[PDB]
Paper text:
We show that Helicons are capable of binding every major class of E3 ubiquitin ligases, which are of great biological and therapeutic interest but remain largely intractable to targeting by small molecules. In addition to possessing increased stability and membrane permeability, Helicons are capable of binding large, flat protein surfaces that are inaccessible to targeting by small molecules, and Helicons have been developed to target a range of PPI targets in cells and in vivo. Characterizing Helicon-E3 co-structures and mechanisms of action, we identified new binding sites for α-helices on the E3 surfaces, as well as potential probes of the disease-linked E3, WWP123,24, highlighting the generality of our approach against this therapeutically important target class.
We performed screens of the naive phage library to identify Helicons that bind MDM2 and CHIP. Among the resulting hits, we validated CHIP-binding Helicons H317 and H318 from C80, including by x-ray crystallography to examine binding to their E3 presenters. Surprisingly, while Helicons H317 and H318 belong to the same cluster, we noted several differences in the co-structures with CHIP, reflecting unique conformational changes and binding surfaces revealed by the Helicons. As a proof of concept, we selected hit clusters for the RING/U-Box family E3s CHIP and MDM2, including those exemplified by H319 for MDM2 and H317 and H318 for CHIP, and designed focused libraries by fixing the conserved binding residues and diversifying the surface-exposed Helicon residues.
Residue numbers in the entry:
A (entry chain C): 7 to 16
B (entry chain A): 22 to 150
Write the structure that this text describes.
Amino acid sequence: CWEAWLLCET
Amino acid sequence: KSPSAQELKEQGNRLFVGRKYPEAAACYGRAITRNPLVAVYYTNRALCYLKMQQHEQALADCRRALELDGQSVKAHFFLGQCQLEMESYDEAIANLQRAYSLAKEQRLNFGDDIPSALRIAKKKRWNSI
Ligand SMILES: *CC(=O)Nc1ccc(NC(=O)C*)cc1
C-alpha cells in the first residue's frame, strides 16, 4: 500500500 | 514558464511509482524550493530515501515534516519504519505507536497497515533481543 501512503496528504 | 510546486510533487509521485527514486527526490526538492512549508513534500522525499537505503537522509526529512505538522500520522509512520531498518527497534516501536493513537484520534480509514508494521517491529525486536 505504498501508493496509498504516497498519495496521502491529510 | 516553470512548473508549480504542486506539479513538481505530482511529477515526483509519478517517478516514485516509476521506481526512479533519485529523480523523484529531486522533483520533491524543487517543490520544496518553490514552497518549503508543505509537509508532504518532505515525507515523500523521505520515502524516496528509504527506498534508496539512505536512512539518515530519510530521518531528516521525516523530522522536517514533523516540525511542519507534529500530528502527522504519515510522518510518524515513515519515521517509525525508517528506524526499524536501522535496528533502532526501541525508537521505531515508539514512533509506530504514536502514529497509531494519532490515527485513532483523527479517525482515519487507513487500515491494519500501522498495526502490521507495529507487530512486525516488536517481534523483530525479540529476535535480536
Ligand atoms: C492498504 C491501504 O490502502 N493503506 C493506506 C495507507 C495510508 C492511507 N492514508 C491516506 O489516505 C491519507 C490510506 C490507506
